[PDB]
């Protein structure tokens, strides 16, 4: 009953078993479109992410909207919601939807709609033709009910830069900044009680686009993910290392601004200023603090603390941007190995930042993510 153009899924019809081939990177877009539009691999994956932090509270919301056939088993395709209290309280569902429809309608807005019929259950996103602006609506009756709000801030949109994460990854970013709002109606399992959640003031986010046709232990075997709004900075990172037995250097998709403009666009990964001064680089170490007073590690095997962040600008002139990076709550822990002294797993951080050029130190929070593989 409109001029739309569609790719709607099914998980008992669209995985396939076939290896497929996805559509090109559209360079300068949001790229919010999937790239596998008929039928999608057993490796591959797609991902529509949105989160939040609250400068005043450090509430945060998490949210991963999938197609992959991983949920086949679970019946559909997954959604991840993952939120964080002021008060560090926690919540958590995977969501599985048979069915994922994604359109662009007539006004150019692109939907998109995870259902679930037989309990009349749904998430879906909107994306503004311009991005400037994103809602999510969240309709899993006696599960979670609210939405969210993401609106971009102004300045440069980052859009128009390299989104590749290493050859097999695409990392887009289509809003990298924004202010968020998110209210919602959190059910414990059993249904029995539901407790509100209001993302505080001040809050900062963005939504990423990410998609790949190899499956995770394929691409890297670590990642960490960050976003964070710090005074008139803001920056975005991605950075991976190659998976087990490759010999390729870390990968990332990193981007540095400042009062909305892009200044450090980081496509490589360094570990001395001086190791590429012909591209804008970047350097990310981890720190480990134990005996601080603020800090957490995840529950695995890695027990570093924080990080340190530096974008470094291309030349011989170029500036230096530094940050502390300090994990200071555990928004998640979840495993990806079997127990043990050594096992591997996936952690979500509430972080706090630091620092600047030289003679600055603007402060703020932000989302982390570590996750490694085995």
Known sequence: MSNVTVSAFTVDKSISEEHVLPSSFIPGSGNIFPKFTSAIPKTAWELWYFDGISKDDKSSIVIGVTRNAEGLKHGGFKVQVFVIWADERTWH????????????????????IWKDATSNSSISFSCAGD??????????????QGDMH???????????????????????????????????SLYSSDATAAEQFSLGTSANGGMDRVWSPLSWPQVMTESYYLR?????????????????????????????????????????????????????????????????????????????????????????????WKFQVRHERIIWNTPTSRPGPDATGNTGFVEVLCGGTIGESYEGVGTGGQCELS
């Open 131 to 144: 991005l400037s602006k994103a809602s999510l609506v969240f309709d899993v009756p006696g599960v979670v």
């Open 93 to 112: 569902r995977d969501l599985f939807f048979p069915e994922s429809v994604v359109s662009i309608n007539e006004s150019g807005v692109t939907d998109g």
């Open 228 to 320: 964070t709004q710090v005074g008139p900075y803001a920056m975005q990172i991605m950075r991976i290392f190659p998976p087990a037995g490759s010999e390729d250097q870390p990968s990332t998709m990193a981007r540095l601004y400042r009062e909305g403009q892009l200044v450090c666009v980081a496509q490589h990964v360094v570990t001395r200023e001086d190791a590429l001064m012909t591209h804008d680089s970047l350097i990310l170490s981890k720190q480990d603090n134990s005996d601080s007073e603020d800090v957490v590690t995840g529950g695995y095997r890695d027990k570093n603390t924080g990080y340190t962040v530096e974008f470094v600008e291309k030349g011989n002139e170029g500036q230096r």
């Open 150 to 184: 993401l609106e971009a801030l102004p300045g440069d949109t980052g859009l128009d830069t390299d989104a590749r994460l290493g050859p097999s990854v695409y990392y887009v970013r289509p809003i990298g900044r924004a202010s968020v709002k998110a209210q919602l």
